Ligand binder design. Structure first.
Ligand SMILES: *[C@@H]1O[C@H](CO)[C@@H](O[C@@H]2O[C@H](CO)[C@@H](O[C@H]3O[C@H](CO[C@H]4O[C@H](CO)[C@@H](O)[C@H](O)[C@@H]4O[C@@H]4O[C@H](CO)[C@@H](O[C@@H]5O[C@H](CO)[C@H](O)[C@H](O)[C@H]5O)[C@H](O)[C@H]4NC(C)=O)[C@@H](O)[C@H](O[C@H]4O[C@H](CO)[C@@H](O)[C@H](O)[C@@H]4O[C@@H]4O[C@H](CO)[C@@H](O)[C@H](O)[C@H]4NC(C)=O)[C@@H]3O)[C@H](O)[C@H]2NC(C)=O)[C@H](O)[C@H]1NC(C)=O
Ligand SMILES: *[C@@H]1O[C@H](CO)[C@@H](O[C@@H]2O[C@H](CO)[C@@H](O[C@H]3O[C@H](CO[C@H]4O[C@H](CO)[C@@H](O)[C@H](O)[C@@H]4O[C@@H]4O[C@H](CO)[C@@H](O[C@@H]5O[C@H](CO)[C@H](O)[C@H](O)[C@H]5O)[C@H](O)[C@H]4NC(C)=O)[C@@H](O)[C@H](O[C@H]4O[C@H](CO)[C@@H](O)[C@H](O)[C@@H]4O[C@@H]4O[C@H](CO)[C@@H](O)[C@H](O)[C@H]4NC(C)=O)[C@@H]3O)[C@H](O)[C@H]2NC(C)=O)[C@H](O)[C@H]1NC(C)=O
Lengths: 212, 209
């Protein structure tokens, strides 16, 4: 029966930018009225820390309690693969639940970023597919965005990372634009940001340039 | 009850008359003290049991992993029919529920575009051939690559993503020693989907000057 705990890593973007603030979030659900008290203990690489901001108990519609705890994580700590452990106690369980999260273990590998123009058979349609291929990155955490003329193209989709045959990861992003917008010869760019990239950021762009 | 799981057939099994599509009922966390599990199967309500309840198996922890399997008609599954697996275990409360069927809605036909590696990838000893498959519904799909009617092995295919029109897409990526691409060898993306004339289309890709 009883309470369950879930531990959530930061957003890859948060991790990779000095500006942003990465957080690790430990959430408890199914906390009865009979024993509503929950204690959190946090550990970084096995050693307790006490800077974690813990929200007041929010009652839920199944009459079950739910309490969140948020540890602010130093960027470089995450990127050096520090281990974050949430330890949850409730007088409703034999032993206090433990969860541990980190960046995945391995050597980082740098993203290769290629753009692919739409297929020839695709010109016949009203909308076109602009492809962004990102291969050979590790670990899998990553963000992918499209823009044109300094402004975000918000009509794209990105697949999850996929475990390649050589242990690394690949993925694809597909921006769909009104075919006319490609005709005009616009410039479209696929911004990618990952730990193994210089400045944690690269961008490549694409357009139609026939003749040579 | 201990966790119970229903599973569809694979896209491919369901798309060729020759194959044998099966629905699966994996029952986890069955314990030594009370195991003698019943399974019963119903399609669109009705009693059937042409199902073969696989002989048991244990696992890593103190737990058994047990399974049943039922063979299925290609049309029945393509026609939406629900498949339910009631799983009688008198260790805990009552019968168990799990329905599954195919996703509902007008099957849409996949568009298939082969893309070639970018110039930039050409300064490497292996290249990437891209196969875009978009606009398809439902997401049950199967993708393969080949050359000279012999099958290419070094490719991986991404899962399908909900595109913004409620259709799906995916990409499949074939990896070849850049020497082969030079030759001009033809490479084939083969997509199998219910909304396809004959459940199969194939697009070709080669070095065009
Ligand atoms: C009573 O009512 C309440 C609520 O109404 C019920 O609570 C629910 O209980 C469920 C358990 O039965 C919970 O389980 C699922 O939860 C997670 C997914 O939770 C996230 O996503 C859902 C939407 O899908 C959201 O609703 C949640 O709020 C969670 O959202 C994320 O929250 C994070 C922190 O808030 C967000 O982080 C942000 O990002 C910032 C970046 O810096 C910053 O860090 C902050 O973190 C924050 O800003 C994050 O972005 C949110 N994401 C989204 C998309 O919104 C799900 O993972 C669980 O699945 C796991 O566990 C099951 C087992 O139960 C596994 O089968 C499953 O596959 C997976 O576990 C896998 O296996 C192992 C070990 O288990 C792991 O090591 C693997 O990694 C793991 N993953 C795999 C295999 O893929 C689970 O299904 C549900 O969250 C609860 N809801 C709420 C609101 O809390 C309660 O159950 C009810 N009880 C009853 C009896 O009725
Ligand atoms: C002791 O150790 C053992 C061994 O480790 C533990 O066993 C584990 O038991 C778990 C029960 O808790 C199992 O559940 C998890 O996994 C299922 C998915 O199952 C597949 O996934 C993994 C691969 O990652 C495999 O290990 C499994 O075996 C399953 O493999 C697929 O199953 C089929 C087998 O028949 C294959 O297809 C068949 O193939 C045939 C030919 O080969 C033929 O073609 C057939 O036609 C075809 O069917 C298929 O190919 C297999 N392989 C792959 C790679 O796919 C997962 O669904 C569970 O999570 C879901 O449900 C939980 C509820 O507990 C939710 O929390 C969670 O969110 C999640 O989704 C939600 O579930 C609800 C239902 O509750 C749905 O209605 C919702 O829609 C859904 N949400 C959303 C948003 O969609 C769960 O994660 C697990 O399989 C076992 N693990 C292992 C390693 O074996 C055991 O736990 C241990 N015991 C104890 C006490 O600790």
């Amino acid at each position: 029966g009883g309470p369950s705990v879930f531990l959530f890593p930061p957003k890859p973007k948060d991790t990779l930018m000095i500006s942003r603030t990465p957080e690790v979030t430990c959430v408890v659900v199914d906390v009865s009225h009979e024993d509503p008290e929950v204690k959190f203990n946090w550990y970084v690489d096995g050693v307790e820390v006490h800077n974690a901001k813990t929200k007041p108990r929010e009652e839920q519609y199944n009459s079950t309690y739910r309490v969140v705890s948020v540890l602010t994580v130093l960027h470089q700590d995450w990127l050096n693969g520090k281990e974050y452990k949430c330890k949850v106690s409730n007088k409703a369980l034999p032993a206090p639940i433990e969860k541990t999260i980190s960046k995945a273990k391995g050597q980082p590998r740098e993203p290769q970023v290629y753009t692919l123009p739409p297929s020839r058979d695709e010109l016949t349609k009203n909308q076109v597919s602009l492809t962004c291929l990102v291969k050979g990155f590790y670990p899998s955490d990553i963000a992918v965005e499209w823009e044109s003329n300094g402004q975000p193209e918000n009509n794209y989709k990105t697949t999850p990372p996929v475990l390649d045959s050589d242990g690394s990861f690949f993925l694809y992003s597909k921006l769909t634009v009104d075919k006319s917008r490609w005709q005009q010869g616009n410039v479209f760019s696929c911004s990618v940001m990952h730990e193994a990239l210089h400045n944690h950021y690269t961008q490549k762009s694409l357009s139609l340039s026939p003749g040579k």
